[PDB]
Structure 1
Amino acid sequence: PKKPKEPVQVPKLVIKGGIEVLGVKTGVDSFTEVECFLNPQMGNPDEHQKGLSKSLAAEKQFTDDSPDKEQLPCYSVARIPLPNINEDLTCGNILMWEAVTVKTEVIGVTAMLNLHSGTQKTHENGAGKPIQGSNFHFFAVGGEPLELQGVLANYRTKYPAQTVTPKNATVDSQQMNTDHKAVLDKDNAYPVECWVPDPSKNENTRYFGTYTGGENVPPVLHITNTATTVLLDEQGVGPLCKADSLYVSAVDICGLFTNTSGTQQWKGLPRYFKITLRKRSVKNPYPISFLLSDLINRRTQRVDGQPMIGMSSQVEEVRVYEDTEELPGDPDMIRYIDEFGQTTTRMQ
């Protein structure tokens, strides 16, 4: 009549569970899907105002601009540990976790539909004025910590106690100040208004973000479980997780909640991630020698005595020989090497 087709062959799930599961001793061709997430850090003023920044400050003289950490929203970051895969790895075949794909989404957008709770009125018998205004959403997934680069307006700003800000603000910090290279290594620390992923350098993490600035720009966000993002680089290699760790970072200032009082304060939302990891074969680019050098100089004899290097080297001369040659006439001759060939010249 009609034959019930043989089913399609799809990937065999070996095990589902929490992060620990990651530790199953799987083969070279397995992979996993890690579903984490991050809460946002807008400042979180009281213990009831989670997802909010402290009521925002308006006009302040450039000089006297000392904001509070509770008003400064910061990048949210986290590190997911991955089980070392070389555990029973064969010869010098070394494997690393590669991030291939990510699916992310902002969690809870529908919540901005409570136009009734601390809301300033739209007008007369209107509802509440919904959250709107400048917004910034960004995230990144990488095999190392997110590398920053700080830049600000008003370098003369007095940055609160518990925050990491650019070191030694100059005027050029209002524009490209190279001394402001850093790294997102602490959650709720680096305030968004001071940093941005340093393009010159994040070579092992991908990031994306968009600033949409305006006094009342309406936020627009979609929520869908059908979209995927590829992290593969130009060679088809996504972030390699050097230290068996996965770095996820994100930021989502949806905009400004405007209080009945008329005070404004930033609103943020947690963000979801779904990273798909695989087992990537790579080569150790370095030499054993250089590796052992660690243990050795990190643990043997260290000595402080007269300089044999630097501009004060008490080494006056070094000559090197290999093979032989017919007895040369100028014994003070000089053999050297430029950036490639051997030069032979008299001193004078």
Structure 2
Amino acid sequence: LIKGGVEVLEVKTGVDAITEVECFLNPEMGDPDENLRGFSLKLSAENDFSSDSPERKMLPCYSTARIPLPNLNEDLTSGNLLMWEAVTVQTEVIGITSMLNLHAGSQKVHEHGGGKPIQGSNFHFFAVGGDPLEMQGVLMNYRTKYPDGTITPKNPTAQSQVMNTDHKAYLDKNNAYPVECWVPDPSRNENTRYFGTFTGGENVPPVLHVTNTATTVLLDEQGVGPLCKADSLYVSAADICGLFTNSSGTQQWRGLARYFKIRLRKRSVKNPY
């Protein structure tokens, strides 16, 4: 049984064989001033495909964090070594009720009406892995001029609007990889589990569930979860909840933090060295 270039043995089952790690991962929506953390810059519209230069602060990016884990190995010479194995994840979007604020800055629905709810296109994505998330580049418009501080498909062609296998990246930097340029790569991610739902449309209602009773199993068909290489766990997220509408009709992406609670167990592996 081989998982991530290491031969996998039995689950270690002593007293302290299980641990939980947690993280609140903040969203990277563009943060156009110091007061509008969790929002993008207002959306430009109707750029020519030949002259499409989005502002850095207008582009939501994938969030990621490396969680350091306890050293398990007295030495790295023993016949069998121990690796942390991610078994389950509890995750939800944090602050969903903040969208019940219809008094701050949102366009009235009609004369005498309350503010317009956040609504429109949304993307809810999370990944748990023992390596950085691996991503594939796809563009709406290959001729888009992406701004300084973003990492986007290099030397893009017309093929970059469909599938161009040149566009491979690691989610190896926070607030750098624009959500519109990158998806999780199903051809890779042997040591990562990812889950994403895209809901597109002008007036799409956000639908978000919270519960501390829901658990996602991270074990593969062979009963093996992500194995944490160099005692490191990777969490990744994108939680674009929809568009906020100012009194003018201008629209901004609104994002929310994602909570992760990951259950880990000690897995015996054959020493590769």
State the alpha-carbon separation in 2 of the partners of residues 240 and 119 from structure 1: 45
Aligned residue type for 1:163: T
Q: 1:61-140 maps to which residues of 2 (within 5 A)?
A: 61-88=48-75, 91-140=78-127
State the alpha-carbon separation in 2 of the partners of residues 266 and 91 from structure 1: 51
1:88 Cα offset (Å): 4.8
State the alpha-carbon separation in 1 of the partners of residues 15 and 190 from structure 2: 26
Could you list the structure 1 runs, at least 4 aligned residues long, displaced by more than 6 angstroms after superposition: none
Aligned residue type for 1:237: V
Aligned partner of 2:232 in structure 1 is 245
Aligned partner of 1:275 in structure 2 is 262
State the alpha-carbon separation in 2 of the partners of residues 243 and 146 from structure 1: 15
Deviation by residue 1:183-232 (Cα, 9 ceiling, x = unmatched): 10000000000000010001110000000000010000011111001000
State the alpha-carbon separation in 2 of the partners of residues 257 and 121 from structure 1: 12
1:220 aligns with 2:218: no
**Higher mean C-alpha displacement, 59-68 vs 90-99:** 90-99
Q: SS of 2:241's equivalent?
A: strand
1:92 Cα offset (Å): 1.1
Q: 1:251-290 maps to which residues of 2 (within 5 A)?
A: 251-284=238-271, 286=272, 288=273
Aligned residue type for 1:92: G
Aligned residue type for 2:106: T
Match of 2:152 among 135, 142, 165: 165
Deviation by residue 1:139-180 (Cα, 9 ceiling, x = unmatched): 000010000110011100000000000111001000000110
1:27 Cα offset (Å): 5.9
1:282 Cα offset (Å): 1.1
Match of 1:184 among 154, 163, 171: 171
Match of 2:180 among 184, 193, 196: 193
State the alpha-carbon separation in 1 of the partners of residues 153 and 77 from structure 2: 45
Q: 1:21-32 maps to which residues of 2 (within 5 A)?
A: 29-32=16-19
State the alpha-carbon separation in 2 of the partners of residues 105 and 232 from structure 1: 20
Aligned partner of 2:140 in structure 1 is 153
Aligned residue type for 2:171: L
Aligned partner of 2:45 in structure 1 is 58
1:87 Cα offset (Å): 2.1
1:121 Cα offset (Å): 0.6
Q: What's the TM-score, normalizing by structure 1?
A: 0.73
Using CA pairs below 8 Å that are at least 6 residues apart, which structure has the higher relative contact order?
2
1:38 aligns with 2:38: no
State the alpha-carbon separation in 1 of the partners of residues 221 and 208 from structure 2: 29
Which structure 2 residue ranges, 5 or more long, are not aligned?
Answer: 1-12
State the alpha-carbon separation in 1 of the partners of residues 193 and 60 from structure 2: 22
Aligned residue type for 2:81: I
Q: SS of 2:97's equivalent?
A: helix
1:90 Cα offset (Å): 8.1
Number of residue pairs matched by the alignment: 261
- Structure richer in strand, relative to its length: 2
Aligned partner of 2:191 in structure 1 is 204
Aligned residue type for 1:263: T
Contact 1:119 1:130 in 2 (8 A): yes
CA RMSD of aligned residues (A): 1.4
Match of 1:234 among 214, 218, 221: 221
Aligned residue type for 1:230: V
Which structure 1 residue ranges, 5 or more long, are not aligned?
Answer: 1-25, 289-348
State the alpha-carbon separation in 2 of the partners of residues 173 and 89 from structure 1: 44
